Design a protein around this ligand. Structure first.
Ligand code: MG
Ligand code: MG
Ligand code: MG
Ligand code: MG
Ligand code: MG
Ligand code: MG
Ligand code: MG
Ligand code: MG
Ligand code: MG
Ligand code: MG
Ligand code: MG
Ligand code: MG
Ligand code: MG
Ligand code: MG
Ligand code: MG
Ligand code: MG
Ligand code: MG
Ligand code: MG
Ligand code: MG
Ligand code: MG
Ligand code: MG
Ligand code: MG
Lengths: 116, 79, 177, 136, 52
RNA sequence: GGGGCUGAUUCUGGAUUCGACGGGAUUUGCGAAACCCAAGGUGCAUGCCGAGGGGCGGUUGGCCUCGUAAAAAGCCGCAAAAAAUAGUCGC
RNA sequence: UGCCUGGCGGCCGUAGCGCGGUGGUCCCACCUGACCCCAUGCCGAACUCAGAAGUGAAACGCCGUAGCGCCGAUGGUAGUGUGGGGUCUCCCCAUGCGAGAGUAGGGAACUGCCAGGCAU
RNA sequence: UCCUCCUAAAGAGUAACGGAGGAGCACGAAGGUUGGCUAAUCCUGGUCGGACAUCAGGAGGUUAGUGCAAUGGCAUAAGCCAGCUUGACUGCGAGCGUGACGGCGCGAGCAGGUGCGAAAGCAGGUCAUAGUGAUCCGGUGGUUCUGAAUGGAAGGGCCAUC
RNA sequence: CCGACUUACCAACCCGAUGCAAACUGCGAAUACCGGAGAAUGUUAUCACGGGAGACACACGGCGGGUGCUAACGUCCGUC
């Protein structure tokens, strides 16, 4: 039910981004892990992703479910987007209120080159 | 003799489909005039104050049925 | 949460073997405790709402939420949006703290306490029961009160069935018949 | 006379009664009287036919009136001019299409059914015919 | 009664103003707003004044 | 055969007829019909054919019966055939 | 390369309900407690910020169930654009277009990206 | 006089002293942004409390609601709350729809300055359609003007508005 | 008498069937109308501007209808 409500309150932003036809960086947030990935404007192709489920950024993090890991994930995904040429991208809350872990990840991504 | 009521009426607003689909339109051209959102705005289609769909770019008008509720959408193919 | 920490393992052990459970989470649990000072005949004077919101605060330390009507029933000549009663809901620690007070110190100030009804379950066993006075609670005395109003307590539990809720309450030593 | 208890609107357009019937087979009783022509049956005619068949069969069974008068027919008062609104409601009719079943019954024998419908049909303008229920 | 017509004049030195409606029986307080001033090209506070 | 005004003590959308008389629900005692039971007493009955009943006739035929069926008596009708009725008001 | 899990979409009523019981090495959920920084117009019912003691009990997901909802032929029927007719409040023929409902049947979804956990 | 449904014959339009109803408003919030939320009805339990309120659970999914009459829509919600605010801005405006005409309406985008949102973005009133009246004559404030010899003034024009 | 009981009677939801609706549509034609491509034919028959008019009393039949009585060589709409 909570997931359904989140989808209900996020599909408005989903449709807004789709009709704007820009690139969107989405954030899946769970109490244990937090993912992040950019999506092509058509909404069916993934260009870059980063999360706490990978050893690459999991071996230097105390716990996955905290703002510190989200910041590292945002830094890594922003660096990969910059090295692949992706620089302009909007940020999708995916229904999660902009505060805490998602806010820290968005700030790290903004600070690591990816301008929103 | 006698008197009868309900002799009043209202002027038609000339609603309906204007381009009928498959035509070449210009920027700002009104596609459909309607009271409610029977047809929803799609690609390069703006919604007016009175739910009028106006094209924001020249191209082709296309009728399709998408969405989870099988709603009709007007799409501007900028070919 | 003294009763919580003391009786949780005991009631789990009892109920698992009673109902042939297979997991710890399957034992019926306690969700919340709700109480509404249903002050209806208070349209003429709003001071009754303040008195209710003070008596309920004294009974359970919080700020009662002044509820508003949503239907405007003409049988009492009321309009929606007017304050009618005040509800207080307690979760977890406060729920347990109020539960022990309603279990232990509830008898001395009430009369003819021959037990409580065993059929107060709303199908799913949520145990809504009512009391006819407020001075039953030790916090509120009789010298400082002007009116006499009761409560509509409801101990909402996670029990699947009414018999499971009854077994839940019996293990929590509540005075049934 | 039977008529709807209430309607959304009092007056209705004249309309046209063209097409074929919808209920053309007996589904309740065993014998039936069904209209073969085209016309409009009125509530008074329906009541007269029902009374005739009931008194012919002595209520030794059951009767089903498949049709129901629901179309209000209005006529202007005598000696008035044209226009000045629509005339007040006068009576109620039921549109009838060829092949539609009008009356149904069971229990009574074939001879009694055919001798009752024979006299009950003379109270209706539309010509009718007698049929028996079959297996599909 | 009906809605009275009022004029919101700019607090600046210019005499620019806007026109609007008002119900001066349930809202006796004056209609002070912030409106754009074409004369000075700045958003300034407009007090409410009579339609005279 | 057609129009206008009344069907309002209020026109301005929120009368406790103050009271007796219907109906609701809340707080009290009890009678197998507001209860669900054979256990103390340890007697001769459940039902099985039941006889026509106060002066007269009668109720699911058993509320009354017993020996192998008869008076029937706990109610209902005839019956109480005081229901003849404010104040003023003639010889 | 095959197992299932997560995220984003296409397709949005053969793609959805009811019943049967499985899933935890991964991922998700339940959950612990909470001064922070955030929150309840009362309560961590919801947001969250610190995590892994336990559980798959509710969910979520998966496999079969024809009890449902639905998709629905061929043929037939109703309707009709043209021309020509009758007994003309309606109907016939030569022509093409041919519905809706109901039968036979189908059916317990396919499919594109990465992101890991599995045997290889 | 204007609006909604049908007659109106599946584009637009289409008449009658035809059948049915409304409009001559309200709102500095009933607008803008952001965040959050999802009923009508019915069943069970519960102190007054009742065919009815305020509560706890369940059946059901828009059968509720739109400030209003009706039609078309609304779940991303156009339906309901909370915080900030005045875009209910100024001058324009490619294009289009509807009218014989006077006219009316939709509208991307540009320049200046704002409100909300971290941001992407939204705001030139209200879910849309009724809520309205040409011209003349005059009133009010400004005016980069006109000023009948000159310099002003009177008056007129221009802009906003009655 | 409790009434044994159905007394040519009426009787909420829930299900199973049977019909009706211009102001009902979970569905849905032909024709009508717009646009894109192509041959053949038609004295440009198409559009824009200017000069000049005339005209805003129509009727009947066919088709789908309101009104009327599916009555009128009656009346009101749309096409030929
Ligand atoms: Mg399970
Ligand atoms: Mg066929
Ligand atoms: Mg078919
Ligand atoms: Mg079929
Ligand atoms: Mg039309
Ligand atoms: Mg929103
Ligand atoms: Mg800002
Ligand atoms: Mg509106
Ligand atoms: Mg004049
Ligand atoms: Mg001069
Ligand atoms: Mg001057
Ligand atoms: Mg047409
Ligand atoms: Mg000319
Ligand atoms: Mg000319
Ligand atoms: Mg004319
Ligand atoms: Mg004329
Ligand atoms: Mg003439
Ligand atoms: Mg004519
Ligand atoms: Mg004609
Ligand atoms: Mg005709
Ligand atoms: Mg004629
Ligand atoms: Mg004439």
């Amino acid at each position: 039910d909570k997931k359904s409500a989140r989808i209900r309150r996020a599909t408005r932003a989903r449709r807004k981004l789709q009709e704007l036809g820009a690139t969107r960086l989405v954030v899946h947030r769970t109490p244990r892990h937090i993912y992040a990935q950019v999506i092509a404007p058509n909404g069916s192709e993934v260009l870059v992703a980063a999360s706490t489920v990978e050893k690459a950024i999991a071996e230097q993090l105390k716990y996955t479910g905290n703002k510190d890991a989200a910041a590292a994930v945002g830094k890594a995904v922003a660096e990969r987007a910059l090295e692949k040429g992706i620089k302009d991208v909007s940020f999708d809350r995916s229904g999660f209120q902009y505060h805490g872990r998602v806010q820290a990840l968005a700030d790290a991504a903004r600070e690591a080159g990816l301008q929103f | 003799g006698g008197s009868t009521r309900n002799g009043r009426d209202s002027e038609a607003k000339r609603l309906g489909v204007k381009r009928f689909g498959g035509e070449s339109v210009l920027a700002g051209s009104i596609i459909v005039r309607q009271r409610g959102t029977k047809f929803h705005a799609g690609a390069n289609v703006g919604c007016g104050r009175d739910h009028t769909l106006f094209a924001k770019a020249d191209g082709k008008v296309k009728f399709e049925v998408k969405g989870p509720k099988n709603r009709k959408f007007i799409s501007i193919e900028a070919e | 949460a003294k009763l919580h920490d003391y009786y949780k393992d005991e009631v789990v052990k009892k109920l698992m073997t009673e109902f042939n459970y297979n997991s710890v989470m399957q034992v019926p649990r306690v969700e919340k405790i709700t109480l509404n000072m249903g002050v209806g005949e208070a349209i003429a004077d709003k001071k009754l709402l303040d008195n209710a919101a003070a008596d309920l605060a004294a009974i359970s330390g919080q700020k009662p939420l002044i509820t508003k009507a949503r239907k405007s029933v003409a049988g009492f000549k009321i309009r929606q949006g007017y304050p009618i009663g005040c509800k207080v809901t307690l979760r977890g620690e406060r729920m347990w703290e109020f539960f022990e007070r309603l279990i232990t110190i509830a008898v001395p100030r009430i009369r003819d306490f021959r037990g409580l009804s065993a059929k107060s379950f709303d199908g799913r066993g949520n145990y809504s029961m009512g009391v006819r006075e407020q001075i039953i609670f030790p916090e509120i005395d009789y010298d400082k009160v002007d009116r006499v109003r009761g409560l509509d307590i409801t101990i909402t539990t996670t029990a699947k069935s009414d018999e499971e809720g009854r077994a839940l309450l019996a293990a929590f030593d509540f005075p049934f018949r | 006379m039977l008529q709807p208890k209430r309607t959304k609107f009092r007056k209705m357009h004249k309309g046209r009664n063209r097409g074929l019937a919808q209920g053309t087979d007996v589904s309740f009783g065993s014998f039936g009287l069904k209209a073969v022509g085209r016309g409009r049956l009125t509530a008074r005619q329906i009541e007269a036919a029902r009374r005739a068949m009931t008194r012919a069969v002595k209520r030794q069974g059951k009767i089903w009136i498949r049709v129901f008068p629901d179309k209000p027919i209005t006529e202007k008062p005598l000696a008035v001019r044209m226009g000045k609104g629509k005339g007040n409601v006068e009576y109620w009719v039921a549109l009838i299409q060829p092949g539609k079943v009008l009356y149904e019954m069971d229990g009574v024998p074939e001879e009694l059914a055919r001798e009752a419908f024979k006299l009950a049909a003379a109270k209706l303008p539309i010509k009718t015919t007698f049929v028996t229920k079959t297996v599909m | 009664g009906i809605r009275e017509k009022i004029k919101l004049v700019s607090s600046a030195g210019t005499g620019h103003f806007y026109t609007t409606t008002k119900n001066k029986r349930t809202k006796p307080e004056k209609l002070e707003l912030k409106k754009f001033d074409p004369v000075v090209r700045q958003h300034v506070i407009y007090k409410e004044a009579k339609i005279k």
